[model samples]
Target chain A: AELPQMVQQLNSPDQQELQSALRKLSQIASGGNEQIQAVIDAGALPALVQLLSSPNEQILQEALWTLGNIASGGNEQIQAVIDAGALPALVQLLSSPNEQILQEALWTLGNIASGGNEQIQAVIDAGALPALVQLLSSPNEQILQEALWTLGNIASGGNEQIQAVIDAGALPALVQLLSSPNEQILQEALWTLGNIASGGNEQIQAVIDAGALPALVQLLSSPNEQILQEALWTLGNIASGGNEQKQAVKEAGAEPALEQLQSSPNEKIQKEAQEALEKIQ
Target chain B: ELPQMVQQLNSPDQQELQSALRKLSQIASGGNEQIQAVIDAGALPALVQLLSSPNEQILQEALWTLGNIASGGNEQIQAVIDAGALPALVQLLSSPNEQILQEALWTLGNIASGGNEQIQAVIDAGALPALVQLLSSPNEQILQEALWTLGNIASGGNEQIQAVIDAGALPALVQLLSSPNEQILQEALWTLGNIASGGNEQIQAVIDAGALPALVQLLSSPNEQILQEALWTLGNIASGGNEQKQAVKEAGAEPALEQLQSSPNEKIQKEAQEALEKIQ
Candidate 1:
């Protein structure tokens, strides 16, 4: 297969050969699972994992991309990357000064965390949580989007993982993003917060205590239905948290906002409004 | 006979009331002479009162007939306004019934299409908020009507345009520039074009509402109609001042404008050249 020759070039003494091989593998692996599995079977993992620390930034980025594509397969492929000890390298790349590198690293981490609880725990244990949470405040929209997406996948794993995101101080930073003019960043923030709210009472309360209610109530009137729906889902989960949380939402003037959404032509959002109102009252 | 129709508009028989409203609407739709006939017959007061009728059929018919009358010349539209159709027409925009809202938009659009005074009358009746909100309607017909009416209002003097901006129509209008529907994209660009035709403040509001990126993107649209409207709007923005010109450049309009110079359509090429000169 073409993968073996590329894998061989991964260890070449010539820098050009090494970069081209990493680039070629990245392109090939992204084609689909068959190509990825072939590359994985061709023994490209350890070389790719090792190059995550390459002093050359281009090679480091290419390596992360290839590993990310490989990790996108199923559980086995993700664990394979973890088994190759890419976890530490991947986590370390989060601190890269380059925004591009950081985004790539975060995107790859998000894919790995999508594997399930064990893979998610591995990312958390690798210490990516705090930095991912910290990147929420980055002035860069893409970085903020990527970081929120990765944390969202982590929070979707289990209660402790959700707690880990909250404990990492993502609340205030995320709550601040609720007012972001950029709709995509605001969308991601709402999604991640929704996942966090889906956790136990403490996690849900943490979202409420962060002053997310008013911002969310305001979002219920967003002209963009997708944003409206995300805010609706977030508030619904919070209202489902407890009586006090429900009252808190009601007191925030969400009742009128929710009442407006009840007329939304979008059926799901209309139902969501109905559900949230029930929990609130 | 015309007075008979007007009298029947108030008949206790719901069926007779409905039939009378429909016949009056059809006659009004016939032509200006017929509209004058209907108006001179004193049909306005009865038709205007029926707008608030709880009967869906009656209000629809009233709105339709009034809309046709408003479509006539200035005095005809003024007569409808004097009949006190503004408030109910503006209020019908919020009706959950699609037919009611659609007919309301048709009538309001016709009213605003008259002249600056007529446009202001509709605005003064509190149409802006509902019109702006209707811009987000899931129904494309309602959305297009809203955009058309808003564009008509915005095409007026500065304060009327500013009223639209203050009502929060800019963001939705700018966002619609990226809509997959060419009709929507065209209507949105035309409305924003009218807004940009104003002084620097109005142009700046369009820019701040995030029109530049989408406008710049549309310069490469395959549809020549869309491309021409986009080119025209950007030309208006550039014609504002050095700052607006710079905003157009910052949105990367130069490359798209440059590419359009070679377009097969003569008008686009000419407009593109004119836009480049304006930007310069």
Candidate 2:
């Protein structure tokens, strides 16, 4: 009934009950917001973070899935977990050499980076940029895609953080990833470019000057609907920045956005398309 | 009968008799040693050198062929006409837009250098300097061939002559010695070794200018035919005098020569074996 008893049964020497309890905890965390809070309030964040180092694969999965839910619960829950020093353990799981564990760790970091400044700083303080940039070169496409998305969210804040992303040598790797045939990778790369292009002339110029516009324009014709949406959104952000970026977007041909504005059924896309057209024109 | 009559009739008039006479002179000069001597004695050398500016193409060809023949006639023929002041006209012809004219001028310079002592004088009078410098540019292949020929001749004399060739940036082209493109490198090395053979000081200067002995050593190579050309060029230069022969021997050309001597081809083997013995 108590937290200790639940965790003890979850880690029992009796293999079947331990397995079943771990599965139940994972299911409960996946259920909704309230169940995730229950797992956190029961001191499960620390326990899950500790369980990350466990050699058993199943236990690691259960802990990771539970951590993902805790991180997704918003700032209060994320801070409580971070206050308990969860960033290092989560960042360590990124290098787990196990795909499932790594995916869950990335999902959790994405949630944490989305929470707000405190968790973002915590991730940054844990030297997450280099790790994320390193993951860009990973042969695993899914991991690279998610890492791009996570970096985009982390870099979404402002110039200083975007500078951190650039200082990590992420631009060249991002340009290479944009050339990937994977639709998800293109979407993630465009989104990251949009965030990097947000700050001002210098940041937008950095992306444009690194030869990103040509690759971005090439993806303007991508058949993937999600990729199209993300690329249009990125174009809008780049066009909104300054005269230099607006010229870059024009030079790279913003005609695709004009066409998308007339045809896209998604209101968000249509709005972004209209906005980009107004800014560039 | 006179050169001015041949020039006026050939240049301004473009007549057939003057052209025919020029061709006969070239033929006689090319005929044999005795005939060339007879033509040189007949005052034909000055007339041939004077026809360098003939407007008629046939007469120009005749003059070029005569100059090439006179070049092979040994020192006396080279002196008689070169003293008649032909090097300047030939050097001026280098800038002609026509490829044939340029090639002829280069051929004439090569012929002039057949009399080796006159080589430094020709260079000092500014004959081969412009041609030598043109080698560094990405000119048409024929121009480069002419430059290579001029460098070979100038490299046949003293330090002043060698320095003039070097001042024209022969060293840069020579440094392209190991170019991966075998044909171009063989031409460049052959040109370099010919220049080095002018004398001991020139040979030592070339060695000091960084003509590696290893490149000379590669001449014994039987596998690459172009490398064989490079080796023969080196052997010719090293054979110029006792000092050069000693310098080459000291720089370790002997082993490569020994290897070529032991080669299975009887002609190459006999020649290399003889050269090795001569150098020692």
Candidate 3:
């Protein structure tokens, strides 16, 4: 059950040795859990961390990719990543000029945040939230997706983390994402914001204050069923959030938009829209 | 509109009566106010009488209208039930026309899903066997509607869940797992999940009906929605007593559970972790 010798070859003086080692390590970890655990057991995390600051985009991308897979393992592995100081390293990778490195780093942070509250807190404390929110404007769809998703996990993490994301001012940019043409990015934005709405009264109100209700109201007409379903679900939470939220969302005109969905050929969307309208009315 | 519909029901014009019923169906398909309007107009008994009409068109339209009314909310559903809708709906379950049969079943399913009181109303009207019988229908729409209603019944409190379980719902839900239709598979899994979440006895019922095996097979599916629901149901199952928990672990749910923990989706990951924690 030996990991690869290339994991140890990172210390080599030759440039070829380090880059080649990271590429192989990335490939191995991506294969399955068994290899990932082997790499962790073999101490590739710290070694990869040392090279995360590399100037070579190719090498940095490989390291981020490898670390992402490592973070994908369970809690023990995630803790190990934190123990080896993967957060600050991942945050540093987010600034890399290389597209793959940024996306992979954001993905790593998302996975790390997906762990329990403590690991999620580690991700927050490492100052990834601001970096992620800023990247919401990234021209790269994949990077924007990863960034939004990571923020989503942080928001969905708990009230404290949600407050952190909001305090970092994630709402405006997130709302802007609704106008994006990439279907998946639009959804990721909605899901992230939905977590905010589900977070609590403060966060839900924060979302409405960010002018999200009108944009989400417009989304009711989206030809996309998944988009409409998620939009309605968030609206449901808003309407059912309490009287203030219900009134805010309704006054924002959720009713007229939701009424159109009532006769949708899709049962799920129809039911969701119907339920939201029930509470609103 | 509602008062006029009632007036037309007493008229000799078949076309007018059908027109009124269809319009009522659309209105009752609306929110509480529209639903309450029909009820206030005393249209329930009049509508129920049309269920006995020899004209299939009138019967179908009337039945669909009641289903819409029932879909309005608890008060509307209870009104339909109070107007003695249960037996009329149940009686139409035996109708030879598939459309009438589906609508009749759809209306009862709506009532069964209404709440504890109304679910018991459907069960009291002897809806259990007929609903189960529809599971074998070649029509996917009827099957989905039937399964969805059963899910709602099972979602009601304990006795209602017990009513569904006693109706032999467990094995039927398990059988529907083999259906290749994504929608059917989803509804079936959802129903099984509801049954499992009900209580130890209900969970045990599903455990006995060979639910875990199909659940394990579904865990291997690529569909995120179905997989998550399947895992959630198994999680609910695994959260039960030691015997039930141990039973799922022995069904080889561990590997997939562990793998699911790494899902890119946070919600699915969290649910997988919760299921894994209880499996041991």
The root-mean-square deviation over C-alpha atoms between each candidate and the true structure, in angstroms, is 22.3, 30.6, 24.1
Q: Which ten residues in a row have the lowest lDDT in candidate 2 chain A?
A: A1-10
Candidate 1 chain A, which ten residues in sequence have the lowest lDDT sum?
A: A53-62
Candidate 3, CAPRI quality class derived from DockQ: incorrect
Q: How many backbone clashes does candidate 2 have?
A: 1
With candidate 1 superimposed using the best TM-score fit, by how many Å does residue A178's alpha carbon deviate from the native?
Answer: 0.4
Per-model TM-score (chain A alone):
0.85, 0.76, 0.83
- Supply DockQ values for each candidate: 0.01, 0.00, 0.01
Tens-digit lDDT track of model 3 for B1-280: 4678788976788788878777877777767888888889988998889889998878877888888888877878899999988888888878888888888877777777666888888888898888888888788888888898788888887567778888877777898888889999899988888887654466657766867667766655667677667656654554433333344345444564576555555655665566556443
lDDT of 3 by residue, A1-281 (tens): 11224434444456455455434333322223433354456445665676577675655565566566567666777888899977877888788887877777888898888888888899989988888888988887778888888898888878888889999999999999888888898888888888888878887888889999998998898889899888887777777776788899878888888888777799888877888899875
lDDT of 1 by residue, B228-268 (tens): 99999999888876665577689999988998988899999
Worst 10 residues of 3 chain A by lDDT: A24-33
Between candidates 2 and 3, the TM-score winner: 3
What are the chain B TM-scores of all models? 0.83, 0.61, 0.79
List of clashing residue pairs for candidate 2: B155-B195
Order candidates by TM-score, high to low: 1, 3, 2
Q: How well does candidate 3 score on lDDT at residue A38? A: 45
Candidate 2: Cα lDDT at B172 = 64
